[PDB]
Structures are given as C-alpha cells and as structure tokens.
C-alpha cells in the first residue's frame, strides 16, 4: 500500500527465516542448614498432638529409636515427635523482648530497647537474686549427675561446667575462655587452683608482658577441676564484674543454658523451616545437633549435608581435658559425648553423610 | 570507550603477574634478618669484607625476594614489620584516619599492608582490621571531594591520597564531568580520542 | 516471536553483557536473525523511489539497530581478548548438554589470538632465556574474572529465600525475598544462576 | 643487587601512562639476558659443587639466584605484554593503515603481530552474517542524525565516496556529508564536527 | 512585612536563575554552586551583581544603596535554599549551617580620595595596596546573659555584624546592671583588620598617600597578606565635635 | 555506561505529535507507524518526534504528567517519604530535557516544569548519597534500591561498585 513492489513486511522476513560418628564438638552453633536430595517436608505442619507429645517426651526423658530407614516420613508420628523433642531447651532469663543467647560482641541487635533494669537498682537486685538461686540449683543438679552440662554466658566471658565422665575427664570441670590477668589474680586470692593449658616495678611489668600477651584472646583459657568448682561458683556469684555497669547490657545478669529443667528455667524451642533444604536457628547445643543428625540419618536414608555456623568465642571449648544414665540424654549421645577431644581451637564447619558414612570437613 | 586498557593491579594477598603497579610495589624494601648465612653472596654487602654474608646479619631486602626466600620453618629468613604497621602507628591511625598523609607514608598503603599478611605473625588479625577501618574511615571524604569539585584545581585534594584512592578520585571525577557535559549539550559531538590528540602533539 | 520481541531480546542481551564480569552465554541465533532482517531492509530501502520520507525513517531505524548489535559484539570481543586462556580451557572441557559460550568464529579468533601471543613472546624473549626457564604457563599469568563484583539488577520472576553472604554469619539479615519488579544491589556470585536463567536482568 | 635494569625498564613504560608507545629498548633487554646467563652459570657451578663435594650450605644461594632469575623473567614478560596492549589500540583508532611515525617506533616482531591481528580481525568481521560482515570498528557512538556538518582541519587531498566523485579536502572548508562516511575521518583528526 | 517579600524574591532569584541557551542547554548556576560548596564543607557563595540586576533590577538597586538589611536577607535566603537542596543530610548533620554571601561586579573602580560623605552606607569599589594586617581575633555573633542575683537567663541574643556592640539591659526583669555574659554560651567567628593604601599612581604630586581601615570576617580572613594589590568591595560606614571614625566592611576581595 | 547511552534508551518512549504533511502507514522493524494525516494525532517514538520537530514537520503534544499541579504533588510526595517513590516515567529527566529544549513554544509553562523536576532530582540524589554512605559505613552486603531510575544510578555508578569491590577484597583476606 504505497511501497514499491519489492517491499517485504518486516514480519514476513522473519516468517521466511568413612567414620561411623563425627567427633564431639562442644562449641555453640547459631544456625544450621541441612541440604539433601530427598524432601524435608515431613518436618512441617506439625499437628498439635505431635507437639504436645514431643514436649511431654522431652520433660520425661523418653528415648526414641527409629528404624534403620523410613520410606514414608510424612506418615511417621514417632519421627515428628522426636523432632519436636529435639527442638527443646531451657533458658533461665525469660525476657521476650531482649536477645539473650549471643552476649559477646552483639550491640547492633541490643540497641534501642526498653531496659528498665539499667537505671532502677532494686529491680537489678531482684534479678541478681533470682539468677543466683537458679545458678545454685543448676550446679546442685550437675553435682548429683542429673544434668550433663550447662553454659554460663556473660558479656565478657563464657563458662562451661561438665559432669564427671564427660570429655574423658573423671571429675567436675569448668572452662573460662577469655580470662584476664586481674580476674586470674582475683581467683588466686580466693582458694581456686586453676591451670592454663595454653624501676624494679617496670621489670615486673616486663615479666607480666609475657604473661599479658594473649589476654582477651582465646589462648587465655582457664581450666578448673575437682572441688574447686564449688568455690568458683561462689566466686562467680559474688563477683563484681559479671554484670556490666555501663553500656547496652547494663544490669542484665548472665544467661544460663541447660538441656534439662532447673529452678527458674523457661522452656524454649528452636525455629525450624524448610525451603530441598532445612534451616534451624537458635542456640544449638551438642545433644541437639546429635539428635538432629540421628533423625535425619533415618529420614534421609543416610544421605544429607550440613553447614554449621559457629559462635567463635566458644570454639576453644574443644581443648582436650584428661553413671550418666539418669542425666536425661539418649544413650548414643552419652556414648558420643564420652570421648576424647580431638579438635583444638577449631570447630566443625561442614558435615557430609553419604551411604551411612560420615566425612566431616 | 577507553582505547588503552592496562592490566589492573590485584588488591589483597595475591598480585597479578602482568601488572606493572604490582611489579613496582614489591620493589619496596622490607626489614629482614638472615637466619642462615648466604655463602659467596658477601659481595652484595659493600661494607662487609668477607665474600660470604655471615649468619645473623640484618638487611632490608625487597618484598619479592622476601616472599621468595620465606619459609614457615623460618630457617632462611625472618621478616620484621615496617614502622608504619606496628602498634604505635596503628593507634594513631585509629585516632583519626583523615589527617594522615598516605602518599608519604607509602605510595601503596593498602596493597603493601595486605601483602604483609603472607608472612606469618601473631599481629595479622590486627593489621587487617586496621587497614579495613582506615579505608572505611577515609571513604566518605574521598566521595565528597570527588563528586563535588567542578572546574577547580584538584592537585590540592589528591596530594594526601595513595594510588587506590587516587584511582577512586579519577572515577568520581569522570562520573561527574560526564553528567555535566551531558546537561550542557556537549555530549552530542563526535570527537577524537585523547590518544590521537596526544600523538598529534608530538 | 514478533520482530519487536527480537529487538527487545537483543537489547536485554546487550545490557546483560555490558555489566557482567565474565563472558555470558552466546546468543548467535538472535544475532543471525537481526543481521538477516537488516540485510533485507537494506535492499527494501534501496528499491524505494528517491525523495520519500519513509527512506529517512527506515534508514534511521537501521542505523539505530546496527549500533546496538555492534556494541554487543564489541563487548564480547573485548571480554574474549582479556581472558582468552581460561575461556579456551573451559571450552576444551565443555560437557554435552551445557550451552556453549563461544560461537565458532569467536573460537577460531581466540585460537589465533593465543597462537599470535605465544609465538611473539617465545620468539622475542624465551629463545634467549636460560634453558631451564623457558616455559610460561598462560593459565597462571593472565588474570581471571572477578566474580565477586557488585552489580545492579531488576527482578522479573519472584525468588524467595536468597542467602546473602552464605559463607559468613556476621550479616544481621541473611535472607532476602526478591519480589517482582524490585531492584537490588548485590554481588554477582550470589545471583549468577538467576541471570543465567533469565529471571534477573542487569540494568 | 639485581633486577635494577628491569625495574628501570618498567618505570620507563609506566611514565607514559596514556598509551604513547615509546621506542623499543634493546640494550636493557640485552643486559638483562647477560645477567641472567651469568647467574645461571654461577648457580649451576654451585649446584655441582654442592652435589659432588658435599656442601649443604650452598642451597640458600641457589634459592636466591633462582628467585632473581624468576623476577627477571617476570619483568620482561610484563614489558612485552604492555607494549602489545598499547599496539592493539592503534588498530582500533588509526584505521587499518598505520602511520609511518608510529611504525618507526615498532619492532619487526611487533609489526608481524599487528598484521596477524589485523588479518584475524578482518576474518572475524567477514564471518559475521551474509556477504560482507558487520564492521564492529565503526558506529562507536549512539546515532542521532543522518547528515552532519563537518569542517576540515588540514589538507588531505581528495576523499572519495561510493558515488565515484571525490571531494577536495582543503583547510577551513565545510561540507554537509552523511554521518556514516565521515566518522572515521572525524576520529582520526582530519575533520571536526560543527554544531549549530 | 516587606522583609518577607524581599526574602522570598531573593529565594526565587537563587532557585530560578539559569545560564545558557536552548541551542546547547541550561544549567542553574547558584543552586548547583550552593549544593557543591555545602557538600564540600565551604559555606559561602560568590553572587555577581549583573546577574541580580538582570533577574530583578529593583533588587540590585536596593543592594547598591542599603546594603546592610538586603545583604542580611540575601544570606538568610541562601541558607534556606542550601537547606532545601541537601534536605536528607547524613546522621549528625541535621542542623543547617549559616551561609556567607560575597559580592562581585564589573563596574569601574572608584578612588579613596573620591569617597565623599554622601556615599555613607553605600556599596563602594575601591582599589589599593595592603600595607598592614592584624592577628585573627574573635568576634561574637550569638550571646547569652545571666543575672548575678536571681540567675535569670536571656539567651540567643544577636549582635550586629561589624564594629558594633550590644548595649546590655539595666532592669533585671538584683541591683542595676546585674547581667553578665556566660562564657561558654557564645558563638564566635574569625575577625581581622587591615589597612588599605592609595594606589601609587592615583596619589597627587607632592603629597603622601592616604590610608583607610578595612574589616574582614569569616572566610575573608587570611586571604591577603601585606604587599598585595587588591580591589575591595565593601560598605562605607562609621565606627573633635561629632567626629566619627569611618571603616569599610569588606564583602568581597579580588587579589590581583 | 555513559549518559549518551542512557539517553539512547530514553529515545524510545511514546509521544503524540500533530503532523502537517501527509503520509501512509510505515512498517518499521519495531512496530507499525500510524497513518500520517495533517492535523491528526499520531503516536511516534521520541527520536522520530525530535527529528520531525527539528525539521519543522510536526507539533509535539506535551505528555500528561507534564503539568504544574501534578509535578508539585510529586515533588511534595518525594520530600515526605524516607525511601524512594515511584516516578511518572522511568526517563523523566531525559524526557524533560529533550522536550523542553527542542520544543518549548508548544509546551506552556516550561520554566516551572523545569524548576520542579530539578527539585525532585536534587532530593532523589541526596537520598542516593545517604544510601551509599550508609552502605559503606555499616559494611553491609545488600541494599534494596526500589523506584530508582537509570540516570540517577549512572550519576554515582562505576564509583560505588569499585569502592565496594575494594572494600570486599579488604574485608575477606584472612579467610
Ligand atoms: Zn535578677
């Protein structure tokens, strides 16, 4: 229509054209990511009955032995109940609007929050008294072999009490990772017998320089053993540097973590979410990780991979140190935790299981 | 469209084999101690009369030689940090980073500081942190100087900047001039390249 | 596929190639279709009687499309010239079922360029070198693409649960839910498959 | 010590940052090669002495000389590659035929490399599409109009168009030619784009 | 009041002045300059006088004859425009800084011996050569006073620019004159005094050159050293029976 | 990506022109050009409109969003929300510049339009500068830049990305 009789419409041209078990890790993970070829959808949409049964089973220390392999995980009530049981821990301070697990080097998430204990003093004293009672009850539970271990997380250092028999030891132990010279000297003047395993006054300062080199660093780990743990408990309860007096975490008592109930405990749960991949967030203790691996071995037919994110200031807890049936742990977990610490200042970063064989990285 | 495209230097602990700037940065000398003597190499030391360098002597070897002869066993050579990277200057840098003169301290500060991490030392976690915080603290002034400076002598603003920061300044200045020339309607002219004009000057 | 969609695909390929640190997948089909359409339109314009405004319209359109095609091919050529050894090594170990990254002409050009560089370096320097030191591995000398560079992107198809900085837990927020039509600033390594599958456009 | 000549050679290149391919330095390369040969001979002699007569103290000297040799090779390789990079741009800026001024500063091997690069580029251009290929070198800026006003800046004899008629390019003369015929002349420096 | 209208007109001048033609393009000249200077850290601009005349001849004519109030209004308008151009400022820089406006023109310069008494409180342009200078002292702009007896506080008092003080109140609103200046609650700026000498050629035969005292403030300090030829634009003002010393509040310097 | 290329992408929007010549339908590779009837609107790509106006063969009709009241509303909205806001066109600056420079006798009240577009541009650029500063200060790894046009990105690009690359290299070296 108007064009010369050789013009081709643009569209016309185009028309024409392997160990059995992994080594025990005593560090505190903060996030876990499991990846597997098979589906993780079984750990979703848990019914009310399953959650109630899981909570009751955890509180009553019931051991669950799943079969060697499961082909219909979505129809297995035992597996989901064991999952809900494995996602339960106890924390003493119950303040829902304040983050409490990561206490070292966390100020962005602690900024701009309603903290009445920072200024008021009677409230701080009440919180301190309750914390002291909870700590004493937890230690008493540990002594009678009714609790395997528990963590104490201050805003400067972290302690780990272990029962008699765990990690190859034969007596109650205690590990303080970031210790300072002043704190150590204060411990010496109280009867505690510890042992680090890792101008004339100016000359004395020079001598202290070799001593004060690795302070505020993971190489200042301090190991207390035997009956000295009781005096350590009393000293920590009566110490004046556990609670910060200036900053964001001013007046907040240290956090207590435990796998079993104690006076003042608050039942908590870990967040699980499947995307195949499965994500679990929160304070991960070794028994939780072992139970999760035990469940996923049967659910995934012995084929999955795990990526572990670790809390660095608790990695030195793997430093070697050398009747637990009522402690409230699975016998397999007790067997695994009663080993000799192989890792040193190092934590697991990648775990892979193929054909029921573990190859940790 | 830049006609000439030389090989970019490699930031971090790894260099580029074909980079000219990385070939000059490693030339800078670094304090070293000869843990095991170099026989028949005493001719290098003009003052030394013997033909062999004795054991325990101290020399300022270039960075490339120190990297080549270094071994974790520390039986052939040991490395001492330069003065700028020790605690005394690190605290000064932590005080305020916009007041120092990183062109006289060292023409390549970030690159040499990163290369120092190849040699093992108990102070590397602090050196890396100091370098990162220095860059973070000096970024904002570089951005403001580069963006907001039109038709003005920039020799006063780039006299205290090392080569990486000078390259960032050039990037900012060429990102500003392009927009300013577009708004003034001078970006619609077909013009010869700078290389052709420079050749014509000869 | 209308010709307009072909032009839009050419524009998208051009923009994606400009901002990518590596050499993206070849799109030789679009190149050939555009070239054929331009070749036909040249004669279609030539036949028309002089003095017609349609001549101006079509010639302007042809000049407007040829520039885009030339720019895309020039970007590909520059990327090939900067990283010839790694590209050639990846092409040698190419597995069937994976889309090719080089058109045959580009592959021949890369071979010839590598041969020229090796011959020149050898003859000029390596002959007179000490006999022990006369072999230079170009796979360990020529630089490599920086896949950690930050890029701008616009999302076309929704993606959920995207992990930011997968190797570190220092980041406060590690999960990003990308919606449709939003724009983000993120590293190239994180969202390389999305760009490869066409779900994300680099602009 | 060593490598001084190589580092001076590298500095010479680094001084002229904006392309500007300088004259080839042959004496420096010769001296570097002689130094490398002497180092290799001394190193081999020391190696034999430590091999047969049992002198374990000579190993660090061998390591030192080997490192020096590696550095000397690295400098020469980088020096050659940078000159190749500078030479490549001449193909994309000064048309196809190189001016004699630039050629006078080029070595014979570099000239052979340039010719081979030009042939490969031409082959790739022709390979694109049917008939004559799409010349990538041209069309280096977004197009805005068909005809542009230009003015000569020097005498260039006569410039011919496909119509078979030449145009007498005299200084200070203006012609209203189409854009696609003058872009290369503008980029070379023979014409100047005149805007209203 | 008319002050608000004048301030609005100055703001419109700053926001709407453009340079260039539609054949090339238009660029706002003073808004861009204000943004660039404020981001760089230099809080000043150099406003020409022919541009202001071209925009609004009345506004330029009210600056050549009553420079004080009109220059103050121009500075306030510049501060408001600079605040609106860079409205989302980074954290910690919410407060807006004060802007100093310098003037410039291409008029033929006058002479020191041609300054009559009629041209008092008028903008003048006199060349000369600097022969002296003083140390950079401090001049207050905002002061706060407090009673000695009842400790009542009257803050944010403004002090006029130039060599002009502030008469302190007598009634306490506590004996007579109970008010003292609080030391730390004072905002100060730089302050310098120069001496301008008549040019070596404008001096008549058989007569020594005359002098004139100058006043410099804020970014005009430490710009001229003794022995420089300058062209000064400033406000002729006053600092025997009825005799008053006269100085020149400098608002612009062009070092030659 | 230079500003000329960003303009090249903005010269494909649709605008309405009123031609004076007469021409039948033109079949372009990117679409079909409507019949050209004198004193009758026909939508054309912006480059064609600019060429016709420069050759004195049309009369550009201003876009809908180019009104004083709408632009004032947009400017007031932009100076109110902390984050970026949607714009009437993805190429508002290029469209404003080209239309107001090449055809101002047809568009009425051009000066106020140019004064309001500039204010909106200044506010958006200040927000972008704040975003860049906050990104570098916090050592983040991701940012959500919604409703941000291409020219505003081009203003600060090739400087932000290189700074982030160097910061990342200096941030993960011990690893
Ligand atoms: Zn009083």
UniProtKB/Swiss-Prot annotation, chain A:
Cellular location(s): Nucleus
A biological-process GO annotation: nuclear DNA replication
GO CC term, one of those recorded: replisome
Keywords: Cell cycle, Cell division, Developmental protein, Nucleus
Main location: nucleus
InterPro entries attached to this UniProt entry: Donson
UniProt KW Calcium keyword: no
Function: Replisome component that maintains genome stability by protecting stalled or damaged replication forks. After the induction of replication stress, required for the stabilization of stalled replication forks, the efficient activation of the intra-S-phase and G/2M cell-cycle checkpoints and the maintenance of genome stability.
Assembly: Component of the replisome complex.
Family per similarity comment: Belongs to the DONSON family.
UniProt protein name: Protein downstream neighbor of son homolog
Annotated gene: donson
UniProtKB/Swiss-Prot annotation, chain C:
Gene: gins4
Record GO terms (molecular function): chromatin binding
Protein name (Swiss-Prot/TrEMBL): DNA replication complex GINS protein SLD5
UniProt entry tagged with the keyword Cytoplasm: yes
Pfam families: Sld5 (PF05916), SLD5_C (PF16922)
GO cellular component, one term: GINS complex
Keywords: Chromosome, Cytoplasm, DNA replication, Nucleus
PANTHER family: DNA REPLICATION COMPLEX GINS PROTEIN SLD5, SLD5 PROTEIN
Lineage: Eukaryota, Metazoa, Chordata, Craniata, Vertebrata
Keyword Iron-sulfur on entry: no
SUPFAM superfamilies in alphabetical order: GINS helical bundle-like (SSF158573), PriA/YqbF domain (SSF160059)
Subunit structure comment from the entry: Component of the GINS complex which is a heterotetramer of gins1/psf1, gins2/psf2, gins3/psf3 and gins4/sld5. Component of the CMG helicase complex, composed of the mcm2-7 complex, the GINS complex and cdc45.
UniProtKB/Swiss-Prot annotation, chain D:
CDD domains: GINS_A_psf1, GINS_B_Psf1
One GO-annotated biological process of the protein: DNA replication
Main localization (coarse): nucleus
Top-rank taxon: Eukaryota
UniProt entry keywords in alphabetical sequence: Chromosome, DNA replication, Nucleus
Record keyword Nucleus present: yes
Localisation per UniProt entry: Nucleus; Chromosome
GO molecular function ontology, one term from the record: chromatin binding
GO CC terms of this entry: CMG complex; GINS complex
InterPro entries documented for this protein: GINS_A (IPR021151), GINS_bundle-like_dom_sf (IPR036224), GINS_Psf1 (IPR005339), PSF1_C (IPR056783)
Function in brief: Required for correct functioning of the GINS complex, a complex that plays an essential role in the initiation of DNA replication, and progression of DNA replication forks. GINS complex is a core component of CDC45-MCM-GINS (CMG) helicase, the molecular machine that unwinds template DNA during replication, and around which the replisome is built.
Family according to the record: Belongs to the GINS1/PSF1 family.
Self-association state and partner proteins as the record states: Component of the GINS complex which is a heterotetramer of gins1/psf1, gins2/psf2, gins3/psf3 and gins4/sld5. Component of the CMG helicase complex, composed of the mcm2-7 complex, the GINS complex and cdc45.
Name of the protein this chain belongs to: DNA replication complex GINS protein PSF1
Originating species: Xenopus laevis
From Swiss-Prot, chain F:
Subcellular localization(s) per the UniProt record: Nucleus; Chromosome
Signal peptide residues on this chain, from the entry's feature table: none
Any Gene Ontology biological process: DNA strand elongation involved in DNA replication
GO cellular component: CMG complex; GINS complex; nucleoplasm; nucleus
Keywords, sorted A to Z: Chromosome, DNA replication, Nucleus
Chief place where the protein resides: nucleus
Entries under Gene3D superfamilies matching the protein: 1.20.58.1020, 3.40.5.50
Function, as annotated: Required for correct functioning of the GINS complex, a complex that plays an essential role in the initiation of DNA replication, and progression of DNA replication forks. GINS complex is a core component of CDC45-MCM-GINS (CMG) helicase, the molecular machine that unwinds template DNA during replication, and around which the replisome is built.
Subunit structure: Component of the GINS complex which is a heterotetramer of gins1/psf1, gins2/psf2, gins3/psf3 and gins4/sld5. Component of the CMG helicase complex, composed of the mcm2-7 complex, the GINS complex and cdc45.
Protein name from the UniProt record: DNA replication complex GINS protein PSF2
Species the sequence originates in: Xenopus laevis (African clawed frog)
Gene it is expressed from: gins2
